[PDB]
Write a protein that binds this ligand. Sequence first.
Ligand SMILES: CN1CCN(C(=O)c2ccc(O)cc2)CC1
Length: 207
Amino acid sequence: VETFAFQAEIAQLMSLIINTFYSNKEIFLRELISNSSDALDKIRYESLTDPSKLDSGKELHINLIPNKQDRTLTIVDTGIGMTKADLINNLGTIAKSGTKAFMEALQAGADISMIGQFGVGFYSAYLVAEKVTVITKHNDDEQYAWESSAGGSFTVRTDTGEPMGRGTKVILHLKEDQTEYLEERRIKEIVKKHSQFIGYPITLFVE
Ligand SMILES: CN1CCN(C(=O)c2ccc(O)cc2)CC1
């Protein structure tokens, strides 16, 4: 297991997300679905000229999997996935510059729900999760697990878990007071409100 420090700006972003009073926490799901959609667009685009890119799975979709026993909400997509280098580089984001732009926007009146416009929407996971684990498989690499409970560091390891084929799985270990996001009607409400026009099937698993 390798342990890495977050860049200062990202640690700052995470601390802001964790400590700022902000009631509209539900936007985390919109942001994660949007990231999944972006990843799905990318593998679709690459497949247009190289069809073999879909040998690792032709179906392009998103699954939402609540688990009340483990207190986890998992978002799974069959998008392009991430290489180890992507994971280490802030999960394939320009998070340093994005965090800067987001901050400048906040000071200028904007609110936390606008986070996705700055390319750092992933970190909104920390509105509801005490720990986030990301399992990912890119065609050009092995399967990796990234994990962070914030506090300035993340880990990366080769994943010997269930093979994914291709894509990214975000496992949210929910805060004790955020278990509403495990309820079917709540998840349905949020997907209908914020993600009604996503261009891939979203399947909400039941328990
Ligand atoms: C373009 N695309 C590349 C890979 N990505 C992911 O695999 C991914 C999927 C879902 C997330 O929540 C975060 C990252 C992010 C953006």
